[PDB]
Design a protein around this nucleic acid. Sequence first.
DNA 1: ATCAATATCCACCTGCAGATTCTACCAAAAGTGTATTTGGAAACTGCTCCATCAAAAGGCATGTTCAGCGGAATTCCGCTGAACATGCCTTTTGATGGAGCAGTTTCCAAATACACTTTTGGTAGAATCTGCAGGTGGATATTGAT
DNA 2: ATCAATATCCACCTGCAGATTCTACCAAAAGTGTATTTGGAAACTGCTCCATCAAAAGGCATGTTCAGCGGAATTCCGCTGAACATGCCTTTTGATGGAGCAGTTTCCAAATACACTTTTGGTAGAATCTGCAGGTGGATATTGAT
Lengths: 125, 127, 107, 108, 107, 120, 95, 89
Amino acid sequence: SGRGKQGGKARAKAKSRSSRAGLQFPVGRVHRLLRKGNYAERVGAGAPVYLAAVLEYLTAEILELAGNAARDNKKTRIIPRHLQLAIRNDEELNKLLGKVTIAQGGVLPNIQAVLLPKKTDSHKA
Amino acid sequence: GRGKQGGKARAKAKSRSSRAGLQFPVGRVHRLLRKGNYAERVGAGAPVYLAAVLEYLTAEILELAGNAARDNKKTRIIPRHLQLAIRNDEELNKLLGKVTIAQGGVLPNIQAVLLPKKTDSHKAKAK
Amino acid sequence: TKTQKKGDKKRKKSRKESYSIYVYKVLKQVHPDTGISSKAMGIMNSFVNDIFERIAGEASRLAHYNKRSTITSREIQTAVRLLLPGELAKHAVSEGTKAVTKYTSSK
Amino acid sequence: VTKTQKKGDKKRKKSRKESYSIYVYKVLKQVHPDTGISSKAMGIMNSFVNDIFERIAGEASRLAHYNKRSTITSREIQTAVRLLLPGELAKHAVSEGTKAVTKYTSSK
Amino acid sequence: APATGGVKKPHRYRPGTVALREIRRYQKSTELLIRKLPFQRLVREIAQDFKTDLRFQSSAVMALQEASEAYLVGLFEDTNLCAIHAKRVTIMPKDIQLARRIRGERA
Amino acid sequence: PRKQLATKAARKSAPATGGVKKPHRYRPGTVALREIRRYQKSTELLIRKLPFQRLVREIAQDFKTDLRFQSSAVMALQEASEAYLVGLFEDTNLCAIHAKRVTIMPKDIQLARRIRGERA
Amino acid sequence: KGLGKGGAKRHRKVLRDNIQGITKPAIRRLARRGGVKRISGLIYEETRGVLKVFLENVIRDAVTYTEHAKRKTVTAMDVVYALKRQGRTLYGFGG
Amino acid sequence: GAKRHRKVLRDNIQGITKPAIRRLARRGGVKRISGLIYEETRGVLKVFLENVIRDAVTYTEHAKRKTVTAMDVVYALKRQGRTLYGFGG
DNA sequence: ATCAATATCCACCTGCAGATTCTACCAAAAGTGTATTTGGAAACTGCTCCATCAAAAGGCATGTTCAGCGGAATTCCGCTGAACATGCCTTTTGATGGAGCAGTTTCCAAATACACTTTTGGTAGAATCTGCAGGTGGATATTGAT
DNA sequence: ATCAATATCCACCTGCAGATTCTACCAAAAGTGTATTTGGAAACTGCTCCATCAAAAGGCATGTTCAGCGGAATTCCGCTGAACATGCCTTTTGATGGAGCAGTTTCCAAATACACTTTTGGTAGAATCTGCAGGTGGATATTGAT
Ligand SMILES: C[As](C)(=O)[O-]
Ligand SMILES: [Cl-]
Ligand SMILES: [Cl-]
Ligand SMILES: [K+]
Ligand SMILES: [K+]
Ligand SMILES: [K+]
Ligand SMILES: [K+]
Ligand SMILES: [K+]
Ligand SMILES: [K+]
Ligand SMILES: [K+]
Ligand SMILES: [Mn+2]
Ligand SMILES: [Mn+2]
Ligand SMILES: [Mn+2]
Ligand SMILES: [Mn+2]
Ligand SMILES: [Mn+2]
Ligand SMILES: [Mn+2]
Ligand SMILES: [Mn+2]
Ligand SMILES: [Mn+2]
Ligand SMILES: [Mn+2]
Ligand SMILES: [Mn+2]
Ligand SMILES: [Mn+2]
Ligand SMILES: [Mn+2]
Ligand SMILES: [Mn+2]
Ligand SMILES: [Mn+2]
Ligand SMILES: [Mn+2]
C-alpha cells in the first residue's frame, strides 16, 4: 500500500519461475495459457517450464538468423523480409514453417536455369 | 381428465437419443465431448446436435455404399463399396479428400491418351 | 446353470466402445436387406470418430476465439458449415436443428 | 492543482493485450546486442511464438488423450517437441527444455 | 509370330495391350500389390534405426502397407499426369520428382 | 554561354558519315529477366490496393450484405492472396519447363492445381 | 439487416466486375515474383478465376466467423482464422 | 547379422520388386514405365516409411511399450496428413 | 572481340516517421503458504498374440527379341515482349459523422455436482447359417495375323 | 473382311470363413431429482475506427505497333521397354513357447483449490531519439549493335 517498502533487499523474497528456470520467456504465462487453453484436465509444473524453453530457444534460433540477414543487407533493424530470408534459407526452419506465410516477406531470389540467357549465338537461342 | 390415477401406472425414463429421435447415442456423444477437453462446459443441445450430424452422414455413406453393393450384385457392404460410394460422390469425396479407406482400391480410370488408336470393336451401330 | 467357477478365468478385458451397433441400426433403416463386413464396419467407425473430432475440434476453437467457456449446439452448427461441403452442410444443419427441436419439445 | 487532467470520465480504460514482445526483445539483445526490430517484424515474431505454442500444446494434448492420461507434463511436451520439430531443431530444443526443468527443480 | 519361339507357334500381343489389361485388372481389385514378408522386413529394418528390439502388431504392419500402397498408387497417378503433360505416355523420374515438388513433399 | 555544351551521350571521333541512328532495343526476355530480379528482391504488394479492396467487398457482399471490414482484414486478404498466386506461379513455371516450354499456359496452372489437390 | 433505412442512408452503388481490377500488369508482376519469364495470353483470365476461387473460400470462412461472433465487421482475426483452417497460416496480423 | 543366408543377398528395400512396383503403377493407371522408375520408387517409399514409422515409434516409446501398435501407426499417419480408416481410432 | 548505351550497383547525405525511452499507475498476474485430493508409476502377472519355422505353394528373375516411343532436327507462323504515347484513377492527405465494437454491471436459464437408481452395450461362449470366393464350362468379345 | 487364339464374361455350384443370433452376467455408463453456482445475454454507453467526401497529381494502366523467336507440327531413327517362356527360390500357410500388453492393487509425490501478498507488463501520452527511405552521383556491369 503506497510506494511499498525500503526493500529491494537481497536474500529471501520471491523468485519468479522463469528466473528459477534460467529463462527470459515467461513460465507463469505459459502455464496460464496452458490451463486456459483446454489441453488436459491437468498441467504439471514442469510442462510450462519446458515449453517456455523450447519457445525461447526457437525464437533465439530465428532471431540469430534474421539478425544476420539484416547485417548482410547492411541494416540494423530486422524487418519482415529478414525473417523470411532466415526462414527460407534454413532447411529446418523452412520445413517447420512450410505452410506459413510471412506478410511482407517476399520470396527468395531464384530463377530456373533454363530461363537464363544462352550466351548469344544462334542454334537454339 | 380430472380424477384418475391412484396406485401404479407411471414410472419415468426415456433415453436422450430417443427424445431426440436418433439412433446414435446422445449420452455418449456428450460424455465424449466432456472427456475431450473441447471446452470447460458443454451445453445440453450440442451432443444432440452433434449426434444427429454423425447419424446423418453415416446414413448418406451407408445409403450410397449400399447401392454400390447392390450394383455389384452383392448383399454385404465391403470397403470397396465404401470407396466406390465416396469417391463417386463429389461432396463426400471432398470431405474425405485426405483419407484412405483400407482395402478400397481406386475408381477404374484410364487417361484417354493411353487407349489404343486405329478404331474400336463390337458393332457400334450397323446391321 | 451359471458358472460360478473363479477358475474358469476371471480375466476382465478392459472394454472398448465403438459405434458398430449404431452404425448397424442406421444401415437397417436405409437398406434393410444389406449387410456389412467387419472390415467395412471398421471403416465406418474410423469415419464417425474422424467427423466427431473434426467438428468438436472446430467448435472448440470457435468458442475459444469468442472467449466463450461452453460449446453449444450453436458452435456445433458453425463448425458443421465450416467443415462440410455445401449440400452435406445444409442437410446436416437441418438434421441437427431437427433433433434438437424434437428433443426440447419432449421433457 | 494539476492533480488530474479535468478528466470527468466514465471508466472504459483498455482491456490490455499481452504479447511475447518484451521477451522476444530480451532474446534478441542477447544474440545481436546492436540490432533492433521493426514493430511489423515483432508482429511476426509474436505470431510465430503463438503458433508454435499451439502446435506443441495441441500435440501434447492428443498424446495424453491417446494414453488415457489426464495431465500434460514435461514428458508429453517433450515428445510433442520431437514429433513437431525437425532434426537438429528437435535435438537442441529437447536438450534446452530438459535443462530448464532440471534447473527449475533443483530449486525451492 | 508364329516366329520360332517355343518350337514355332505364334501370337504376341502388341506392346501396351497387356499393360492396359493389367490396368483394368488392378483398378478393379483391392488386394495389396507388394508381397507381405518383404514389406514387413523393410518396415522392421527402418524401425530398427529408431529404436532397437521392437515387435510389431500384425495389424500395424498391415496399416503401414495399406497406407504405403495407397500413397504410391496416388503418386503414380500424379506422376502419370506429369508424363502426359509433357506429351509422353512413359513415366520417368523427372515426373515423380515434379509431382513431389508440387505436392510439397518437395525439395 | 551554355549552348548545351555536353561532352556527348557518346564520344570522340567523327564516324557520323552515313545516316544510321537505330534506337536501342532490348531483346525479348531481357526486360522480363530484369523484372524477375527486381520483384524477387522486394516485398511490396503487387496488386493495386483500391481495386483489390473492391474485389473483396464484391465477393463478400455476394455472401452477406451489410458487412464492414477493418482495413487490416483487407490487407490480410491481400498478403495471403498475393503469397498464394506467387506460389502457384512458381509451381506453374515448373509445369511449363517440365513441358520443354518457357511460357506458362493455362494447362500448367491446371496441372499444378490438380497436383496440389485443389482439384485432386 | 440494420444497414438499410433509406432517407438518411442508402444508395450504396452497385459493385460489379471488380475482378478486372486484377490487371494484366499486376498479374505479370506476380508471375515475375514467381519467377516466370514468359506469359501466354490466356493466363490473365485463368489467374483471375483462380484468385476468385481462393478469395471466395477465404472470405466465406472469414464471414462465417464474423456472423458467428454476432459481428457486422469482418476482422483481421476472422481472416487469419479463415486462413489457418484453409491451410494457409498467415503471420503478421494478430496471429 | 543373419536371416537371409546363401543364394540370396539383396537388401530389403530390393524386396520391393519391379513386378510389385509395376503393379502399383498399373493401379495408378500407368501404361508404360521407364527403367529408372523402379529405384526411384524405392527411395520414395523409403522416405515415406521413415517419416511414418519414426513418428509411430515416437508414440510407442512415449507409451513405454516395446511393440509398435496399429494405433501408433494410425496416429502417425494422421500427423503426416495421411489419415487411414480401418485400423482403429 | 570491341564498345556505345543504359542499367545498376554501392556509398553518401539527412530529415522524419517509426522506434526506443520513460514516469506514472494499476489490476492483474504471479508467487506464498497451507490444506485435501488423487493421478498414475510401480510391481506383479495372466493370457493374448508375436516371432519363428517347417512343408506347401505359387511369383519372379532372366534373356531375347522387335514394336513403337521419345526426342533430335528442321521449319515456319503468329503470339507475345519491348517500347511509346496518352491520360486516368489510384494514392495521399485529411477531415468527420456515427456505426458498432467492446467495456461494465445486472441476473437467471442452464450448467456443474452429487447421490442414488435403472439400463445397456460389451464380452464370452456356443451353436448355427449363410454370402460369396473361387472352381467349372461353355459362349463370345477382343486382339492380331493374313 | 476373315479366322485363329486367347482373354473375358456369365450362370451355376457349394464349402467354410466370417457373419449372425441367443443366453447370462455385469459394471459401467446413462438417467433422474435436488442444491448450488455461473456463464454470458441484456442493457447502457464511451470511444475506436470504418465509411465517405474532397481534391490534387503523377505513377501506372491502357492500347498500339512491330517483329524476334518460341511453340508446335512434322519426319525419322535408334534405343529402350513390353511381351513372353517357366524352373527356382522366396513367400505363404499354419502350429507353438514366451514376450509383453494389459489387468489390478497400492500409496505418495505432486496437482488442485483457495487466502493472501507482492511484482510486473501493459498503456498513455510527451519527449527525443535515430535508421534508413529516397534523393543523388559516379563506378562498373551488362547488353545489344557491328
Ligand atoms: C456483390 As454482387 C453485386 O455480386 O451482389
Ligand atoms: Cl511436469
Ligand atoms: Cl447447447
Ligand atoms: K466524432
Ligand atoms: K457411474
Ligand atoms: K529459335
Ligand atoms: K524452339
Ligand atoms: K533393355
Ligand atoms: K525391360
Ligand atoms: K510432497
Ligand atoms: Mn561474340
Ligand atoms: Mn512520429
Ligand atoms: Mn487413483
Ligand atoms: Mn513419337
Ligand atoms: Mn450506435
Ligand atoms: Mn443388451
Ligand atoms: Mn462374442
Ligand atoms: Mn466369382
Ligand atoms: Mn473355361
Ligand atoms: Mn476390318
Ligand atoms: Mn459471471
Ligand atoms: Mn488510358
Ligand atoms: Mn513377462
Ligand atoms: Mn514494470
Ligand atoms: Mn536507398
